[PDB]
Amino acid sequence: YQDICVLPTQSWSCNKLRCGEKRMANVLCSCSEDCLTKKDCCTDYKSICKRETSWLKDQCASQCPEGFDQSPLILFSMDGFRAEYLETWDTLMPNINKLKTCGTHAKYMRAVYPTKTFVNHYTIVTGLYAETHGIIDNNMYDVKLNQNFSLSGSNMRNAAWWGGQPIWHTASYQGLKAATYFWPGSEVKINGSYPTIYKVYNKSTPFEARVMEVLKWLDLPKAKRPDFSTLYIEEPDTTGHKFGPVSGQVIKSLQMADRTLGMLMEGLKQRNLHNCVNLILLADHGMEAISCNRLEYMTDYFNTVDFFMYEGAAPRIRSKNVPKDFYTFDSEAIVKKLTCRKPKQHFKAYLAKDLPKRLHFANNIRIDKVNLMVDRQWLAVRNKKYKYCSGGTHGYDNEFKSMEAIFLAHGPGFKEKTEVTSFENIEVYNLMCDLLKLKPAPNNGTHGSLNHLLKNPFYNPSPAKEQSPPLYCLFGPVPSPDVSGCKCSSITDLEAVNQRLNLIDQAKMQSEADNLPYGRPHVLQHSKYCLLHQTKYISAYSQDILMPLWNSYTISKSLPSASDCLRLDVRIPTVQSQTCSNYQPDLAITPGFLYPPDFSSSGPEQYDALITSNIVPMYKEFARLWNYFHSTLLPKYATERNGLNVISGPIFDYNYDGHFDPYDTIDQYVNNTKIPIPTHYFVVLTSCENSTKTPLNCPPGSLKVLSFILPHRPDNSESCADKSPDNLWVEERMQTHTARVRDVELLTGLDFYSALKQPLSETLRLKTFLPIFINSV
Ligand SMILES: *[C@@H]1O[C@H](CO)[C@@H](O[C@@H]2O[C@H](CO)[C@@H](O[C@@H]3O[C@H](CO)[C@@H](O)[C@H](O[C@H]4O[C@H](CO)[C@@H](O)[C@H](O)[C@@H]4O)[C@@H]3O)[C@H](O)[C@H]2NC(C)=O)[C@H](O)[C@H]1NC(C)=O
Ligand SMILES: *[C@@H]1O[C@H](CO[C@@H]2O[C@@H](C)[C@@H](O)[C@@H](O)[C@@H]2O)[C@@H](O[C@@H]2O[C@H](CO)[C@@H](O)[C@H](O)[C@H]2NC(C)=O)[C@H](O)[C@H]1NC(C)=O
Ligand SMILES: *[C@@H]1O[C@H](CO[C@@H]2O[C@@H](C)[C@@H](O)[C@@H](O)[C@@H]2O)[C@@H](O)[C@H](O)[C@H]1NC(C)=O
Ligand SMILES: Nc1ncnc2c1ncn2[C@@H]1O[C@H](COP(=O)(O)O)[C@@H](O)[C@H]1O
Ligand SMILES: *[C@@H]1O[C@H](CO)[C@@H](O)[C@H](O)[C@H]1NC(C)=O
Ligand SMILES: *[C@@H]1O[C@H](CO)[C@@H](O)[C@H](O)[C@H]1NC(C)=O
Ligand SMILES: *[C@@H]1O[C@H](CO)[C@@H](O)[C@H](O)[C@H]1NC(C)=O
Ligand SMILES: [Ca+2]
Ligand SMILES: [Zn+2]
Ligand SMILES: [Zn+2]
């Protein structure tokens, strides 16, 4: 029986016959004693040679052992492990399934865009969007550096590419030690230094060898023992590329991944650490099927192709002559030439600033202006010679279900037998800091939003303090003469109609209860504004922008004068007001309403909406979207959801950094005026997850939110709808522009839901939720 003792020279498991065997040259992994004292053991050693119960055969059932002060944290990434693999194949992966059964797992973890390996691994350890950490793709150019970055080049090890602070520096700077067994960035002298221990990347290293060395670091003297370590394997990504995500080959690769994790857990058990180590097992992105039959070619759109293209699932286009022509390159002409060309194009071109704001993909010089958003399972490539089109790939929109990643966790810091809703991989950095009792460097995670995964949360979130309390808008006389140019000939007693805008204290409180049921937004921006109380809606009107910061109203389940009737608001000083004359006839902009007059009961109520403090400058083509949304879509939503609380308002993000900006920054205004033009309009729809309740009697833990950040564009070319005779394209357009409430807050400087009677950390979950339709549609 040589074979079962020729196995050691090629196997990592403690087979039945070799329990006690004689050490020779040379076994990769060693049974049996003296394996233990020599710390040479095959991970199964005790279950297989000592007849102990293996980790796997055990039941689910905070005891770190000798010299383990604080829980070590292990971050284990399996490249390309899509959330779907776990949902359908979990019984083919016994070790991961145990972990899933006994620990804490998410329904899925959302990656960042583009859904690429270096982008997402670096986001995981920094908590940063790619536009901030700087690794915006596996391939990129930087005109300031005038340097190219690639996965097969030594420029990638240049620290100038790598921004932010990876978790291994956060630990090291605060007195801990970090060891990485492969991780993008770990071989770079980021901020001038390396992890405490790190390995030179070698894709050929047996996964088993990677686990055994991670186990040895745990075996180190306490003085040198890492407190944080990473583990990385290339499967199921490698096989997924070659054969696609639905293939026998990928299942084989997933089982090989499953055994990798099995070896790790048995090794922890052996060392009595299984209930000591906190372990996070996750992935950088998912995997999707491609075909040489599903290719879009630039040659079909350009007679002449004088440009450089990053091809595939997340394309960009830039000048071929860089850096001379990097900026003069006409990205707008490229986008226009690619727009609405064939009835069923399988991609859509964008300037980066017009990309859905939820992608946070614009504010970096390396992010070429021309971006293509590609339909799932397709690729956009230069010409018909493109060759890398069989099997699988990734890169797409992080909303696609195939791009979702796994997230499983286990250890004393984590709840047991617990399943949490999906969350974003930007949240994981704060989580790891909490598990290592580290203070996080500034990042894009929302600290505390993942506290429901943890047994005793290390971080307790603080409410944001309002920076700008309201000012007073005083009731006053109609100016005489009235030089607004506004007209509303139907009004018979103007002083009486305007007294409806001057509510008694109990009417204010009633309006507050019905239309601001979660409290008024707090203003974190430095802004001068006042609150306008009305029966059906309340707003914060700001002289800084001559319009509301926000407008809020509640519509119940079940139930259109535009500028036939409009008048100045006597509570707003004229010099701080929009006028009807400000909207001169020769214009592409027309007044839009935040609280829609088509919702108020006919009669005196409707006059409360028809005032110059309830209007926002809208492109006519955007108004078309807006009016269809509030006249047709919104009532249908409200009937389906048993009422809706609606808060809406303008966004100005002219430096496209994803945040509100000082008012000096606005670069566009209504012609001949100083009425600023918003880049986006936000809408936040709140109802009850239990549709037997209304937005007003919902338990706070059961609120349902749907937010939109709608680009304020002068045409509807994004929807290919300017020649469209209907509005059935509006819903689809809005669906790709949903957003987290947290995105709205960042862009507006507003803070919502301050009055909810639940823990702040629960409200943070609500605010980080991303509404997604695309996998339902
Ligand atoms: C995601 O999270 C990251 C991390 O917090 C965050 O990146 C940060 O962005 C802010 C603002 O956009 C940056 O603020 C800068 O701070 C630096 C520090 O070096 C200063 O150099 C800058 O000062 C300028 O702005 C002043 C405005 O008052 C000007 O007066 C002055 O003239 C300067 O031009 C600037 O304030 C911050 O540096 C980064 N941090 C990192 C590490 O990158 C990002 O904004 C978050 N993204 C989203 C969408 O929320
Ligand atoms: C703001 O006005 C510009 C310019 O308006 C044109 O020039 C002005 C001096 C005045 O004479 C107007 O009557 C002219 O139309 C607008 O830019 C125009 O855009 C339209 C497309 O919508 C186009 O047909 C014209 O060529 C453009 N004019 C020029 C000279 O560029 C701009 O659209 C206006 N924006 C707003 C807020 O409506
Ligand atoms: C929806 O709610 C119904 C009413 O239950 C009562 O109100 C809800 C909001 C909860 O607070 C519950 O504690 C109350 O008893 C339920 O009967 C019904 O089951 C709920 N629907 C679902 C799917 O749970
Ligand atoms: N730490 C690393 N250093 C260098 N290259 C890496 C590292 N980790 C992964 N890779 C490579 O990146 C590939 C994944 O890229 P992709 O399939 O394009 O997402 C892997 O198959 C490896 O070839
Ligand atoms: C970067 O690569 C491009 C090709 O995409 C090349 O034209 C350019 O000269 C390169 N620049 C440097 C500094 O290597
Ligand atoms: C770089 O390292 C220095 C020295 O520890 C530290 O003060 C600084 O915060 C680090 N910067 C970043 C971006 O991590
Ligand atoms: C990479 O690892 C393989 C497999 O262990 C080994 O054969 C090879 O020597 C390593 N390559 C380098 C360049 O170190
Ligand atoms: Ca901004
Ligand atoms: Zn990857
Ligand atoms: Zn890949």
Short mmCIF file of C-alpha atoms in Angstrom, two decimals, residues 361-677:
data_model
loop_
_atom_site.label_atom_id
_atom_site.label_comp_id
_atom_site.label_asym_id
_atom_site.label_seq_id
_atom_site.Cartn_x
_atom_site.Cartn_y
_atom_site.Cartn_z
CA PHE A 361 -18.18 56.73 -9.85
CA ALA A 362 -17.01 60.14 -11.12
CA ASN A 363 -14.72 62.08 -8.77
CA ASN A 364 -11.31 60.85 -9.86
CA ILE A 365 -9.08 61.93 -12.75
CA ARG A 366 -8.49 58.23 -13.53
CA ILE A 367 -12.20 57.72 -14.22
CA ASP A 368 -12.32 58.60 -17.88
CA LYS A 369 -15.35 60.70 -18.70
CA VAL A 370 -16.76 58.23 -21.25
CA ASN A 371 -18.33 55.25 -19.48
CA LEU A 372 -20.45 52.43 -20.92
CA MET A 373 -22.98 50.68 -18.68
CA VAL A 374 -23.30 47.22 -20.27
CA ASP A 375 -26.31 44.91 -20.09
CA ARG A 376 -25.75 41.76 -18.08
CA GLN A 377 -24.20 38.88 -20.08
CA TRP A 378 -22.98 41.23 -22.84
CA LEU A 379 -19.64 42.88 -23.52
CA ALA A 380 -18.79 46.08 -25.36
CA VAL A 381 -15.56 45.75 -27.34
CA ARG A 382 -13.79 47.52 -30.18
CA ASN A 383 -13.98 45.08 -33.10
CA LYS A 384 -15.03 41.68 -34.35
CA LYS A 385 -11.64 40.19 -33.60
CA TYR A 386 -12.32 40.37 -29.86
CA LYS A 387 -11.42 36.98 -28.46
CA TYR A 388 -12.17 36.87 -24.70
CA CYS A 389 -15.88 36.23 -25.03
CA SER A 390 -16.54 32.68 -23.80
CA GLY A 391 -17.30 31.43 -20.29
CA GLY A 392 -17.84 34.10 -17.64
CA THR A 393 -16.82 37.54 -16.53
CA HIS A 394 -17.61 40.33 -14.12
CA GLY A 395 -17.40 44.11 -14.01
CA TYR A 396 -21.07 45.02 -14.41
CA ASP A 397 -23.34 47.27 -12.35
CA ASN A 398 -23.19 46.13 -8.72
CA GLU A 399 -26.98 45.94 -8.64
CA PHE A 400 -27.00 42.88 -10.92
CA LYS A 401 -27.72 39.70 -8.98
CA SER A 402 -24.84 37.85 -10.69
CA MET A 403 -22.43 40.53 -9.42
CA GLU A 404 -23.44 40.05 -5.75
CA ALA A 405 -20.90 38.50 -3.41
CA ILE A 406 -21.15 36.18 -0.38
CA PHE A 407 -20.68 37.30 3.23
CA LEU A 408 -20.47 34.77 6.08
CA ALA A 409 -19.09 35.37 9.56
CA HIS A 410 -18.39 33.20 12.58
CA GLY A 411 -16.82 33.69 15.99
CA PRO A 412 -17.48 35.11 19.43
CA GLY A 413 -17.95 38.65 18.12
CA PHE A 414 -20.81 37.48 15.87
CA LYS A 415 -24.35 36.37 16.57
CA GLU A 416 -25.17 32.69 16.12
CA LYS A 417 -27.62 31.12 13.64
CA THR A 418 -28.38 34.56 12.34
CA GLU A 419 -29.25 35.71 8.81
CA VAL A 420 -29.09 39.45 8.03
CA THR A 421 -30.31 41.38 5.01
CA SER A 422 -27.88 42.34 2.26
CA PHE A 423 -25.41 45.16 2.87
CA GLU A 424 -22.57 46.85 1.01
CA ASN A 425 -18.94 45.81 1.13
CA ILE A 426 -18.01 49.43 2.06
CA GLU A 427 -19.45 48.68 5.53
CA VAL A 428 -16.95 45.88 6.26
CA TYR A 429 -13.96 48.09 7.16
CA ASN A 430 -15.77 49.72 10.12
CA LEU A 431 -16.92 46.22 11.15
CA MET A 432 -13.38 44.86 11.19
CA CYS A 433 -12.15 47.86 13.20
CA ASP A 434 -14.91 47.18 15.73
CA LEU A 435 -13.86 43.53 15.95
CA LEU A 436 -10.25 44.64 16.52
CA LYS A 437 -11.27 47.52 18.81
CA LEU A 438 -9.59 49.95 16.41
CA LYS A 439 -10.63 53.46 15.60
CA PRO A 440 -11.44 53.61 11.86
CA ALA A 441 -9.80 56.02 9.47
CA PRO A 442 -12.43 58.19 7.72
CA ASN A 443 -14.39 56.05 5.25
CA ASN A 444 -17.72 55.65 3.41
CA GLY A 445 -19.18 52.96 5.60
CA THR A 446 -21.86 54.04 8.06
CA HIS A 447 -20.40 53.18 11.45
CA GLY A 448 -22.93 51.24 13.51
CA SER A 449 -25.10 50.18 10.57
CA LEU A 450 -23.89 46.56 10.99
CA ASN A 451 -24.34 46.36 14.78
CA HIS A 452 -27.13 43.79 14.35
CA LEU A 453 -24.47 41.25 13.24
CA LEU A 454 -22.49 41.57 16.48
CA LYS A 455 -22.95 40.05 19.94
CA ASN A 456 -21.75 43.17 21.79
CA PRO A 457 -21.21 46.06 19.38
CA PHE A 458 -17.94 47.82 20.03
CA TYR A 459 -19.13 51.11 18.51
CA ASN A 460 -22.30 52.95 19.46
CA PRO A 461 -23.41 55.52 16.86
CA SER A 462 -24.09 59.17 17.67
CA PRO A 463 -26.81 61.32 16.07
CA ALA A 464 -25.54 64.15 13.90
CA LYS A 465 -26.07 67.55 15.50
CA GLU A 466 -27.91 70.08 13.34
CA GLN A 467 -25.57 72.81 12.17
CA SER A 468 -28.27 75.21 10.94
CA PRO A 469 -31.45 75.71 13.01
CA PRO A 470 -34.43 77.35 11.27
CA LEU A 471 -34.90 81.07 10.86
CA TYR A 472 -38.29 82.80 10.74
CA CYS A 473 -40.33 83.62 7.71
CA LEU A 474 -42.73 86.32 8.86
CA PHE A 475 -46.19 86.76 7.47
CA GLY A 476 -46.53 90.11 5.75
CA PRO A 477 -48.48 92.20 3.26
CA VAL A 478 -48.79 91.56 -0.41
CA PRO A 479 -46.32 94.02 -2.01
CA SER A 480 -47.92 97.01 -3.74
CA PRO A 481 -47.51 97.17 -6.54
CA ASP A 482 -46.91 93.49 -7.18
CA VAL A 483 -44.04 93.33 -9.67
CA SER A 484 -43.68 89.54 -9.60
CA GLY A 485 -45.42 89.19 -12.95
CA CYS A 486 -47.39 86.32 -11.36
CA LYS A 487 -51.10 85.92 -12.03
CA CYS A 488 -54.02 84.02 -10.48
CA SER A 489 -57.27 85.62 -11.61
CA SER A 490 -59.50 82.98 -9.96
CA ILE A 491 -58.74 84.16 -6.41
CA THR A 492 -61.52 86.38 -5.09
CA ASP A 493 -60.29 87.29 -1.57
CA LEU A 494 -56.49 87.30 -1.63
CA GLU A 495 -55.99 88.20 2.04
CA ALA A 496 -58.22 85.25 3.00
CA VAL A 497 -56.44 82.80 0.68
CA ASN A 498 -53.06 83.90 2.05
CA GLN A 499 -54.22 83.41 5.66
CA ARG A 500 -54.37 79.67 4.88
CA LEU A 501 -50.53 79.99 4.86
CA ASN A 502 -50.50 81.33 8.45
CA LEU A 503 -51.69 78.38 10.50
CA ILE A 504 -52.72 78.35 14.12
CA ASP A 505 -50.35 76.47 16.44
CA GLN A 506 -52.54 73.37 16.56
CA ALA A 507 -52.84 73.32 12.75
CA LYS A 508 -49.05 73.46 12.55
CA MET A 509 -48.74 70.55 14.97
CA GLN A 510 -51.34 68.56 13.02
CA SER A 511 -49.46 69.22 9.80
CA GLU A 512 -46.23 68.25 11.55
CA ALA A 513 -47.79 64.95 12.69
CA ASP A 514 -49.26 64.04 9.31
CA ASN A 515 -46.52 65.26 6.94
CA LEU A 516 -43.33 65.00 9.05
CA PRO A 517 -44.13 61.80 10.97
CA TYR A 518 -40.45 60.91 11.35
CA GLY A 519 -39.39 64.42 12.40
CA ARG A 520 -38.19 67.32 10.33
CA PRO A 521 -34.83 66.89 8.53
CA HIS A 522 -31.91 68.33 10.45
CA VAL A 523 -29.67 70.63 8.43
CA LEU A 524 -25.95 69.81 8.67
CA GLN A 525 -25.00 72.17 5.85
CA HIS A 526 -24.53 75.86 6.69
CA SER A 527 -27.76 77.18 5.23
CA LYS A 528 -30.19 80.00 5.95
CA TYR A 529 -33.73 78.67 5.75
CA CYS A 530 -37.13 78.87 7.39
CA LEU A 531 -39.98 76.41 7.74
CA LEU A 532 -43.21 77.00 5.81
CA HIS A 533 -46.11 75.17 7.46
CA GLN A 534 -49.16 74.33 5.32
CA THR A 535 -52.14 71.98 5.79
CA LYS A 536 -51.00 69.38 3.26
CA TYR A 537 -47.22 69.90 3.14
CA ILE A 538 -44.31 71.48 5.00
CA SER A 539 -41.08 72.82 3.51
CA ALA A 540 -37.77 74.32 4.54
CA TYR A 541 -37.43 77.36 2.26
CA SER A 542 -33.86 78.64 1.83
CA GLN A 543 -32.92 82.12 0.69
CA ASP A 544 -29.50 80.70 -0.24
CA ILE A 545 -31.01 78.94 -3.27
CA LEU A 546 -34.34 80.84 -3.57
CA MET A 547 -36.19 77.54 -3.07
CA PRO A 548 -36.88 74.72 -0.65
CA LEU A 549 -34.11 72.57 0.73
CA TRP A 550 -36.88 69.99 1.15
CA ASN A 551 -40.64 69.59 0.89
CA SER A 552 -42.55 66.89 2.81
CA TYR A 553 -46.11 65.55 2.63
CA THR A 554 -48.04 62.34 3.28
CA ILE A 555 -50.55 60.94 0.77
CA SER A 556 -53.10 58.37 1.90
CA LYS A 557 -54.19 55.26 0.04
CA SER A 558 -56.41 56.46 -2.85
CA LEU A 559 -57.63 59.96 -3.74
CA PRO A 560 -53.48 70.58 -12.51
CA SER A 561 -53.16 74.34 -12.88
CA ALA A 562 -49.52 75.02 -13.69
CA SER A 563 -49.09 78.72 -14.46
CA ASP A 564 -52.71 79.64 -15.01
CA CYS A 565 -52.54 80.46 -11.30
CA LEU A 566 -49.44 81.35 -9.30
CA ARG A 567 -48.65 84.08 -6.82
CA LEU A 568 -45.88 85.29 -4.57
CA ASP A 569 -45.63 83.99 -1.02
CA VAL A 570 -46.08 86.85 1.46
CA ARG A 571 -43.92 85.07 4.04
CA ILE A 572 -40.81 85.30 1.83
CA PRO A 573 -39.04 88.64 1.23
CA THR A 574 -39.21 89.58 -2.47
CA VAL A 575 -35.43 89.80 -2.82
CA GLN A 576 -35.29 86.20 -1.57
CA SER A 577 -37.98 84.96 -3.97
CA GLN A 578 -38.36 83.48 -7.39
CA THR A 579 -40.72 85.50 -9.54
CA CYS A 580 -42.92 84.52 -12.44
CA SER A 581 -41.02 87.15 -14.42
CA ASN A 582 -37.79 85.25 -13.59
CA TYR A 583 -39.24 82.50 -15.84
CA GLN A 584 -39.27 84.45 -19.10
CA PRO A 585 -40.90 82.89 -22.12
CA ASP A 586 -37.75 82.28 -24.22
CA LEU A 587 -36.51 79.43 -22.00
CA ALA A 588 -35.75 75.71 -21.74
CA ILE A 589 -36.72 75.90 -18.04
CA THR A 590 -40.19 76.09 -16.56
CA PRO A 591 -41.46 76.10 -12.97
CA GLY A 592 -41.90 72.67 -11.40
CA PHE A 593 -43.76 72.05 -8.10
CA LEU A 594 -42.36 70.03 -5.17
CA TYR A 595 -45.64 69.45 -3.45
CA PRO A 596 -47.83 68.68 -6.49
CA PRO A 597 -50.93 70.88 -6.75
CA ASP A 598 -52.68 67.99 -8.40
CA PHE A 599 -52.83 66.32 -4.97
CA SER A 600 -54.63 69.06 -3.08
CA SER A 601 -58.40 69.01 -2.89
CA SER A 602 -60.00 71.44 -5.30
CA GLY A 603 -60.98 74.70 -3.68
CA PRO A 604 -58.95 76.83 -1.28
CA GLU A 605 -56.56 73.97 -0.51
CA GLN A 606 -55.10 74.11 -4.03
CA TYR A 607 -54.10 77.75 -3.58
CA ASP A 608 -51.68 76.62 -0.82
CA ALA A 609 -49.56 74.81 -3.41
CA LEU A 610 -49.66 77.52 -6.11
CA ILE A 611 -47.00 79.80 -4.59
CA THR A 612 -43.47 80.86 -5.64
CA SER A 613 -42.00 79.14 -2.56
CA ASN A 614 -43.23 75.75 -3.89
CA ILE A 615 -41.45 75.91 -7.26
CA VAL A 616 -38.12 74.63 -8.54
CA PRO A 617 -36.56 75.38 -11.98
CA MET A 618 -37.05 72.34 -14.21
CA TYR A 619 -35.89 71.60 -17.72
CA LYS A 620 -38.98 71.04 -19.82
CA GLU A 621 -37.81 67.54 -20.68
CA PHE A 622 -37.26 66.74 -17.02
CA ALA A 623 -40.64 68.24 -16.10
CA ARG A 624 -42.12 65.73 -18.50
CA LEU A 625 -40.57 62.91 -16.45
CA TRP A 626 -41.45 64.65 -13.17
CA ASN A 627 -45.10 65.34 -14.02
CA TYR A 628 -45.67 61.80 -15.26
CA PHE A 629 -44.09 60.48 -12.08
CA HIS A 630 -46.19 62.53 -9.69
CA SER A 631 -49.45 62.42 -11.69
CA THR A 632 -49.42 58.70 -12.60
CA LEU A 633 -46.67 56.64 -10.94
CA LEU A 634 -46.91 58.13 -7.45
CA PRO A 635 -50.67 57.49 -6.97
CA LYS A 636 -50.14 53.88 -8.09
CA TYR A 637 -47.25 53.47 -5.63
CA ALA A 638 -49.43 54.97 -2.89
CA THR A 639 -52.29 52.55 -3.61
CA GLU A 640 -49.94 49.57 -3.62
CA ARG A 641 -48.17 50.62 -0.40
CA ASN A 642 -51.22 51.91 1.54
CA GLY A 643 -50.09 55.53 1.50
CA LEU A 644 -46.70 57.20 1.19
CA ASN A 645 -44.72 59.82 3.04
CA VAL A 646 -42.90 61.89 0.41
CA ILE A 647 -39.90 64.12 0.95
CA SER A 648 -38.33 65.76 -2.09
CA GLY A 649 -35.95 68.53 -3.00
CA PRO A 650 -33.03 69.82 -5.03
CA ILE A 651 -29.43 68.66 -5.11
CA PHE A 652 -26.47 70.77 -6.26
CA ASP A 653 -23.42 68.61 -6.89
CA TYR A 654 -21.53 70.61 -9.49
CA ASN A 655 -18.09 69.27 -8.42
CA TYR A 656 -19.59 65.71 -8.64
CA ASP A 657 -17.95 64.49 -5.41
CA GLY A 658 -21.16 62.91 -4.04
CA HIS A 659 -21.54 65.60 -1.34
CA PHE A 660 -23.32 68.88 -0.95
CA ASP A 661 -21.07 71.83 -1.77
CA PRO A 662 -20.76 75.46 -0.70
CA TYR A 663 -23.23 77.61 -2.55
CA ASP A 664 -20.37 79.41 -4.36
CA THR A 665 -19.79 76.15 -6.28
CA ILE A 666 -23.02 76.17 -8.34
CA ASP A 667 -22.09 76.76 -11.97
CA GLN A 668 -25.51 76.93 -13.67
CA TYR A 669 -28.46 79.32 -13.22
CA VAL A 670 -31.77 80.14 -14.87
CA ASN A 671 -30.85 82.52 -17.68
CA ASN A 672 -30.50 86.17 -16.64
CA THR A 673 -31.19 85.32 -12.97
CA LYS A 674 -29.42 83.98 -9.92
CA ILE A 675 -31.89 81.10 -9.50
CA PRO A 676 -29.59 78.07 -9.24
CA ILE A 677 -30.24 74.98 -11.37
#
